[PDB]
Amino acid sequence: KISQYACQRRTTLNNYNQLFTDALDILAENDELRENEGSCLAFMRASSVLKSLPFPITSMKDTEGIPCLGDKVKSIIEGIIEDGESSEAKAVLNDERYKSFKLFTSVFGVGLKTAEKWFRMGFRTLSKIQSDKSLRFTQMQKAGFLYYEDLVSCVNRPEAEAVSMLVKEAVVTFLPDALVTMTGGFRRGKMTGHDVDFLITSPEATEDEEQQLLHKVTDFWKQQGLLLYCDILESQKCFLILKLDHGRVHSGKGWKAIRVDLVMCPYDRRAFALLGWTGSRQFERDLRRYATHERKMMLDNHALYDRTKRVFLEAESEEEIFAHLGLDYIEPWERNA
DNA sequence: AAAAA
DNA sequence: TTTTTGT
DNA sequence: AAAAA
Ligand SMILES: Nc1ccn([C@H]2CC[C@@H](COP(=O)(O)OP(=O)(O)OP(=O)(O)O)O2)c(=O)n1
Ligand SMILES: [Mg+2]
Ligand SMILES: [Mg+2]
Ligand code: NA
């Protein structure tokens, strides 16, 4: 029996149902834009379950017993079985609102609210937005337009590794006992990503040392001329754009703009932070949903709390978090829900 | 949109 | 039916 | 702020 929870499924990058999931991902994205949160999440859960299947759906009998596939979703699957295409997803791909939202939000610093604003103003192209004399752009959007081609090309493994070296070299300069772990997609075995994410922790650093590290590391990069964009969120994390010199990559202008995210956590909470930052987003949502609805527990990136026992559960590894929740251990490369 | 309360 | 959906 | 991350 397949579980409705991603945290009770093993999802690798070997997708046998991309015909169905690409259509479901488009329908979900449209519902996000139309502020239909419920319908959006239902199409995301249906897409996630199909990604876990060890075989391709070739008939409607194949969908029997699979959870998260209600009547609406089964109609979409039936249509794709019929002629290899989704008429519903095709209509979304040709919709002017959907096309504008995809194009506008492809800019770093532009989300659903700004994309909706520009569409209602009558904008349809990035050229018309950038050249407009009345529009005022945030610092994030200015960086998003300036480094657009580099950021839209995404990041490969040689680039991510080159970035890992830069992060580790900078971090150990200020905290020599610090542990730096690449998280996100790359930890789950992905070949590419929209960014490179890292978790930093130190077993001997003080409360003040822990607080100052991200400021020290980003100032160091600013001094080198490598910091293209920086936003530090106090507890603690930062959203960056780094200048990655081609010579650093072991695989034009001679460099590439790379989106990098850094997270600093207290040593004793490192397992919770690693689990939260490894992802996928769907795996994390279902872990938290399972904890709440199935175990009466509260899970977040910092802790696990048992509401019945009225106690915080400690963990030195991800394996211990899974054991507390009563879940079989899912490896990082199996969390691609 | 699907599943549970 | 209403509520929940990653507080 | 709100928005974006
Ligand atoms: N809405 C989100 C977004 C992110 N995360 C967590 C898990 C993934 C980790 C990385 O965030 P992203 O870098 O956006 O996700 P990604 O899994 O690494 O995908 P990509 O490789 O394209 O960056 O943060 C999350 O829990 N919920
Ligand atoms: Mg990432
Ligand atoms: Mg990210
Ligand atoms: Na964006």
Give the method of determination: X-ray
Q: C1' nearest to CA of A237: which nucleotide?
A: D5
Q: How far is the CA of A258 from the CAs of A130, A142, A196, A309, A316, in angstroms?
A: 22, 15, 8, 45, 32
CA–CA gap between residue A26 and residue A39 (Å, rounded): 12
Structure tokens of A133? 């004399």
Pairing of the two strands A192-193 and A155-156: antiparallel
- Per-residue three-class SS string for chain A: CCCCCHHHCCECCCCCCHHHHHHHHHHHHHHHHCCCHHHHHHHHHHHHHHHHCCCCCCCHHHHCCCCCCCHHHHHHHHHHHHHCCCHHHHHHHCCHHHHHHHHHHCCCCCCHHHHHHHHHCCCCCHHHHHCCCCCCCCHHHHHHHHCHHHHHCCEEHHHHHHHHHHHHHHHHHHCCCCEEEECHHHHCCCCEECCEEEEEECCCCCHHHHHHHHHHHHHHHHHHCCEEEEEEECCCEEEEEEEEEHHHCCCCCCEEEEEEEEEECCHHHHHHHHHHHHCCHHHHHHHHHHHHHHHCEEECCCCEEECCCCEEECCCCHHHHHHHHCCCCCCHHHECC
Q: Hey, what's the torsion of the CAs at A110, A165, A149, A184, to 10 degrees?
A: -40
CA angle A232, A237, A241 (to 5 degrees): 60
A286 CB and strand C closer than 7 A: yes
Token pair in block for residue A208: 């003040």
Protein residue closest via CA to atom 5 of ligand 1: A281
- CA of A64 relative to ligand 1 center, distance in Å: 31
> Does any strand B atom come closer than 7 Å to the Cβ of A207?
no
The token pair that represents A14 in the structure block: 């070997």
The rounded distance, in Å, linking the Cα atoms of A262 and A232 is 9
Instruction: Show the domains of chain A with their CATH numbers.
Output: 1-94 (1.10.150.110), 95-153 (1.10.150.20), 154-267 (3.30.460.10), 268-336 (3.30.210.10)
| A109 CA to D4 C1' distance (Å) | 6
- Who among residues 26-65 of A has its Cβ near strand C, under 7 Å? 37-38, 41-42
> Is the CB atom of residue A273 positioned under 7 angstroms from any atom of strand C?
no
Q: Is A152 annotated as a binding residue?
A: no
Q: How far is the CA of A109 from the C1' of D1 (A)?
A: 17
d(CA A50, CA A43): 11
Resolution in A: 2.6
Sheet holding A196-201, edge to edge: A179-182, A196-201, A255-264, A237-245, A227-233
Residue with token string 């559960």: A313
According to DSSP, the residues that pair with A261 across neighbouring strands are A197, A239
Name all residues whose Cβ lies below 6 A of ligand 1: A 184-185, 190, 193-195, 197, 276-277, 279-281, 284
